[model samples]
Target: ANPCCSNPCQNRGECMSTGFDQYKCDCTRTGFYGENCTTPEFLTRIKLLLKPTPNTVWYILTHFKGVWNIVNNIPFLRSLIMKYVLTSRSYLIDSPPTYNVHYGYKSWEAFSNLSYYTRALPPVADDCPTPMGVKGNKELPDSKEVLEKVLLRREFIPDPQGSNMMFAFFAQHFTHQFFKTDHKRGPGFTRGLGHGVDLNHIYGETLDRQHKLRLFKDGKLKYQVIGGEVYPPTVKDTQVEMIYPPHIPENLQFAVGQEVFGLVPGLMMYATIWLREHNRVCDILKQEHPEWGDEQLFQTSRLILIGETIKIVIEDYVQHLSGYHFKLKFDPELLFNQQFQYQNRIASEFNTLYHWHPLLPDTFNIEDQEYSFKQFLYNNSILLEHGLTQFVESFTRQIAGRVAGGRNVPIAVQAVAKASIDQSREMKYQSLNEYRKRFSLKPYTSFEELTGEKEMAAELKALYSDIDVMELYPALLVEKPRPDAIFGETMVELGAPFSLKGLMGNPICSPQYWKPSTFGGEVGFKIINTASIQSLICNNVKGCPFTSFNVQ
Candidate 1:
């Protein structure tokens, strides 16, 4: 008996039993082709078929290359940066200050002021917004189309290894520190500069600067402390002063972070953790140095907070991305002094490079219920609606996007891409090839050698002719991704050190604070414990099923 099943593979294929009830579907239809003929295959009349990364590096350049070829050649080192991004602390070694040598922020202080903070420069002229600019400018494809065809096709895949949703929330928390642009609400897009992840905006960057907010001086750069936490202070039981409306009793309400925190309630759940960390440190410092004035206490506490944040980013998060467990230590020795007289400010391209909205899932899974990512985007009900514990659990235990950057961009991200390019034209950087030239990294000689997909390469060629005049954004989207990276070698090269330098060059990492005595010695290190996401969630959330995240 042939033991053939009765059209068991749905309408498209035939099923035959290899063992009792165990059948295999010989999927014949183009739309369906899996062991069960159920999973939708990426085949059909699609204009551009985005390819998934080969499990291992079966393609791209990996063979040995000469020094001449090394600069431009996307090699294994390019492959490594995404794996291990920022490094652990060092005595003196640091990266060379290539910043603002040609153009961009250049300051030892991460965010001393606006001049030190870099901003997304609008493209040079109004007409330059289109990828294809006036004849003299860069010859490029429409940035919107790149997102649609190459980078924005929906191909959401989960990591093979289990990754909880909390990581994306965690990532956004850190990401906001660097790339929070105040987008155009009505009149038109305006290019605004951003403070390097200095945490200024956490409590309203403009509030204190203009004397519109209260600090509770002994030099009040912090909240008034009570018991083991922060509380709104009062003289004789009636709150003495009020600032920024319905003053949030620091204890009752979560500490504020980037202004965006106000936009999402669920986001605040994560925000509160940092506030707690900040307050926790504040309380400890006050305890140890009772005699220290408010200004000294607050400034010192802030420095310690920045250092701890940097440490977590490098040692835990960046370390999580590596393969051989490769590392990046904050050795001042690596910090070679440069001649450009750098003043670290933010960069125009920096915002575009940090587009991580794609990491968010459409919804979050918690306990048994699911919450919408879109619903949560502009809604802050997580704290008010779901409450703290539930929301934190939803964020931490819930799995988000994986480490690798997705090839297809989503609508939310596409709008961002379009706006970024528009801003670029408002204040354009050197052309795509120009940036490579500036970095001393070789220009990718041809799109031909950049991809294995002949069609994709040709598509690239047809969209933007001549390697010299290519735009920055699309090229970044299509470059071949190195092992375990979200974008390509180019992105890794740009983001890795740029981010590393941001942390390394920060004034907080200076001798005055990075040393133990500055934080009131050994107890200080314990207070600023090397707490990873794993530890933080477990310590805070009741039963935060301790999980891990991908490197992206």
Candidate 2:
């Protein structure tokens, strides 16, 4: 009827005809809220079809709580932190000062000018001369006068060859304690003296020559270089073996420095008892009902145990970190404020998706479309809360414990607990047996066995295959010859964020072949810088120290 009718509402709302050429707008909803209303009741029906009424908050809460209870109540995890980690001692030392005391050259000179008797020097027999004299002539000087004259004359030099021999002797005997008997003593065992001492001696000799020339020019003393071939020092072939403790039946070696030594065994015993009790409860549940499948039973078991562990970890973090106590906060950045927000978000999302059903066959409807969204939000929130709580708790507890105990807990207990809780939850979802089956990985049992295998190659191949190949060619397994061999040249290059020479090059690849010059090249720099950014972002706050025995 009209030309404007063809045009209609340009915004896609309803256009109405008026008396004139102009049209009137009967504005229909256009944005999200309006779209939700106008997009057909069919959409709601789709939602209803996807998300059933049985999917409710209570169901999620019950499931989450149930799993929490089960995991927390597990026998092995009852005293998870107390068992695995060191606690505060009663020493009560003050925290270390933040600022370091800097000593200038004058400050050092002031101390150096102090009387020798007042200084903290090693005591030696008067007739034996000073330790310095023993190095110069390969024999002790007769007197302090002779020793002082020799030192002033620049004739006294430390025995590089003898010192190396002594170091090698101590290392060969003591270093075996760190590794398995069959494993060969590597360069670290010799404490950086594994290489022949020729270079070191030559360097020392050069320094000595310079000192002698200065002394002679000043009319202090004269010295000459001996015209004989200098032989390098060699270690004795005698082997010393470490004796295992007969009284300690278990792997005492691994447990040596762990806080759980006595406490963990007791806690573990309690955990075992609790596990048995859980098994009995599950058995009772099974006997009361006959229709439950193996999967359902396993799921229920997982829900109970893993849920409990999460609860325990949460409770521990909350209780240990004083700042984490729930309260009103002026700022959102407050620790408890974040926790409250996270909890509310989890609770809100959970409520939106979960439903109540008095007589339903399935207690939880995982298939409900909204349930996934709910689960995603809840899971993410839980993970975030766990991380935040752990960080606060760990830092608080560590600082407090270190102040109290005067010892650094090398591994953060809260962090470990958080990790364990996450892994436990994942294990529950997959089922520990299922997870183990999937990965073909056994529980960490032996130190040697634990340290034996390589993990990064597989991860690198999966994540950075494209750039990794171009940059770190040696790390690629495809390029490596005889892939099964324990020792080979690594095509993969590592640096900066992760020191590749320590991890990829040492046990996996020959250290001799690790091209430091090549690693400093353009390709190496690009790869390292790129990987470091990701590493920095992901692990910015919670940084872990490198503790690889092989690398050390």
Candidate 3:
């Protein structure tokens, strides 16, 4: 009674006294941790403690004592860690606070609020555009017509604003797989958990699941192999089905994960290779965990596949797109900010900003020979004709078509350029100048200044009476590049936080989604640590020209 009166165990704990007057504390409150009832427990706290690690961290820390020694004494052990992990961010205590304004809300809110739309800056009035136009013409020239004259960049070098065009296609493929915004044929955009990687482009929605293809075996989402290839069950039905074109009766025209697998040979080839990779991973897992079921083996393999995807995209694809300079690593903790609620979703402006249409060259190289895109429009006969190896050989070896910008865009992409602009316009964005202001940039004083080319700028001046009225898409295409960036300064500033925050916004933020166990522990992460575009090709493709690949 005296001990209970003193409340030594606190209100959350009950005191049971023995004959000797010794007491034990029974802390039964929901959040109580440790020996005392005073200690607190929380999922976020527990999660925070375990972080600074990705799902592929089986090689990190250890299951037991000797595990560390085994990992340490090897020559490639450190390289394994270094390759897969660039940085393990502490999101609980420190993450980027300033960039993503809506940090806590789910995917639905970010898309619904129109939070990223361009608006008038503090100093500028919204009534009209800045008086920065050339102010000479009643209307702007037809974008297509004007584009015919100055759209396609003429040469590989020698110019103030048009040389070194880089096709962000590879970057787009990687980015698209990572995120696809909600957009339908109408007014407001669709709504859903933005972090959901629908895998629509790959394990597509249109009759794909109906076709009875191989899937991730995650049980939670079986149709989720979602792309770079068709993952198969090692035990049975290992060969993926493919459509055959009569032209080439016998080649590697294998079926794959995405609905749009037949889009192009390059797309198909990449999909095929990535598919092989997953099955390969699954087989390896099967051998190690001989007692594991097909579903369990597939699940672990899928996680490893995703981890590898993240590694290649952020480390290789993204880095290459940045003109071989600058870095863009995933630090999901950056999405956390307690001071303000934030939501991560694909924005209309963000979708519109990804206007790299000009990068699709009319012609592509395969086996050192140039092939016109017109030949392969929906006919995926090439795989059955020349085989997948040739296509990968060309794409991997030939540098990506230099993405065109401003007047440098090739004539081949004019229609796409116009269509992209029209679609972006359909999204009904604010003025390009408004966006520039929103990104904390200056509005171009005149069209000439906007394009940095007197002709294009003058044409732009004629198109919009005032700079404020200019549509964001076409105007962005014409804006001069930043000193170091492939895109304009406006682009440089506009997309910085969106991509980074987008990755952090995924539902898989908790360590549960990325623990080393999910990646098959140390043995599994070792597989990924040794992976790359080149290594993936060599491992999966038949006659992949492993040495001559020169994969970029």
Candidate 4:
């Protein structure tokens, strides 16, 4: 009759069967000190004293980024510190949640709460210094004017690693799942269905939205066979709800999960791929569980899709981003029994950081014909005309534009660039130096240090005399990129915490949900295990002869 038989101790605390009916958790080396060893040892008292702003204890724990190389070398120590860093930050209820038309209510609270963005660093104070080129000012150039000079792409500088259009397309598809914004509610609020990553981009953000897209009979999203190629059901065919610029022709309009996917061919390409995969998985599940109803098949297939998305994102996507010699894995098991808050809330700073407009080129050269940025917008004809296989091949062979400062994003979408600058100001995020310090990285002393380019630094110096006053949004784009990486040193440091925490903290990664039982069974588990970008394309994209994330 040992009480420790159930293995209640968390964070790998050894459960000691002391008395016949009692137990003790030996948390000495586990970095936790509670009876169940679920609480982080560091900053337990300090956290109680601090409000949201400048969480001194959080700063202390997160400061590990400055010495990341050292901590990264020690796997166990890194895990211990990572656990403390995540838990030391507040959870869902700590900050008030936000709601929009698609999500928020007691119904979905079990899944995730609709949330106001969480802050990586504490909110900026009024006393904090302002940067040059602050929007809405008269004397100096406005944010838009500065952006045209600094952010416009002078020429197409491809990714150093030869990453292809597929990589960029995948990133757009993946980030859209969780990074939705509520323009109506202002920058602080999100129109996102869940705080966690749920592939909401493919499977609609809410149940009502999901039902409309569903085929109802086969547990598949509605589809159309166009010229023998599978594509999303057109809005006219399904009469499904969709929103798009009025200028787009009715024939080009597609009823997809996110209405905006119809506007960009690359995003639509991914939506089509995932849609095919979802249906394919449903067919397999139906064959295996003949007894299961359409409802069960659809539900289980959605879970598999989400799992596959997570695995691809971690193994293929993040691996490429890391550019590490050692291969990173989709190892959810690593965080098991760790003291972590198994919840997520998107951060405002994260939204600001992901404004990677520079990644997009001004024109797309498809099938020997070049389409301008204007033509690229609200255009689905390109995908249908070239066909999926040729389109995928074309994108993979083409080099993507660099994410650095200067004229890069097509002039057609320059309004988006201006909006991002405006949003950051409205949020009043802390300075670049403050953010770097928050992530435990060294602050830049001069514009030269912030951006390696002499002319770029000079431009910034003219705009922001003091390097310390550089705003988070513009500085993120201008900063010198990390060696062999897509992002910069500060971006990686500040962004990694949000990315890792959000990805790892999904409910599916929790102990109970990690089991094969949560997915259909061993077969479902195997499907998730074998998922990859290559496998998805080969299986779903008809006549796909080759697959790669880079320009081959």
Write the number of the candidate with greater lDDT, choosing between 1 and 4.
4
Q: Best to worst by TM-score, what's the order?
A: 4, 1, 3, 2
lDDT of 3 by residue, 1-552 (tens): 222222244323444444443656677653455544556568636854664432123223323445555654664664454333322321211121211222211244433453333211111111212222222233333656645554565653222222111223345554554343344424223332323243433343334441345443422222223223332221124244443444532323334554334556666656656667767787787777777876687557666766666556555554454332223344333333223123344544555666665555556655556667677654555554555566555554454332324655656656777766555444434456656644435667777777666777676666565665666667666776544334665664565445544544444443445455767777887775566666777787666554222234
lDDT against true structure, model 3: 0.48
Q: Give the TM-score of candidate 4.
A: 0.79
Q: Give the Å shift of residue 343 in candidate 4.
A: 0.7
TM-score of each: 0.65, 0.18, 0.63, 0.79
Model 2 lDDT, residue 34, Cα:
39
**Lowest summed lDDT window (length 10), candidate 4:** 98-107
Instruction: Between candidates 1 and 2, name the one with more favorable TM-score.
Output: 1
Q: What is the C-alpha lDDT of each candidate?
A: 0.50, 0.22, 0.48, 0.71
Error of 2 at 476 (Å): 37
The C-alpha RMSD of each candidate to the native structure, in angstroms, is 18.7, 36.0, 16.6, 11.7
lDDT of 3 at 316: 58
Error of 1 at 82 (Å): 15
lDDT of candidate 4 over 97-134, digit per residue (tens): 33222221212442253555655544433332332222
Tens digit per residue, CA lDDT, model 1, 101-202: 123233454233333224322222233333323333244466666556565646664433334455566666776766555444311221224335566544
What's model 2's lDDT at 315? Answer: 34
lDDT of 4 at 260: 74
Q: In lDDT terms, how accurate is model 4?
A: 0.71
RMSD of candidate 3 to true structure, Å: 16.6
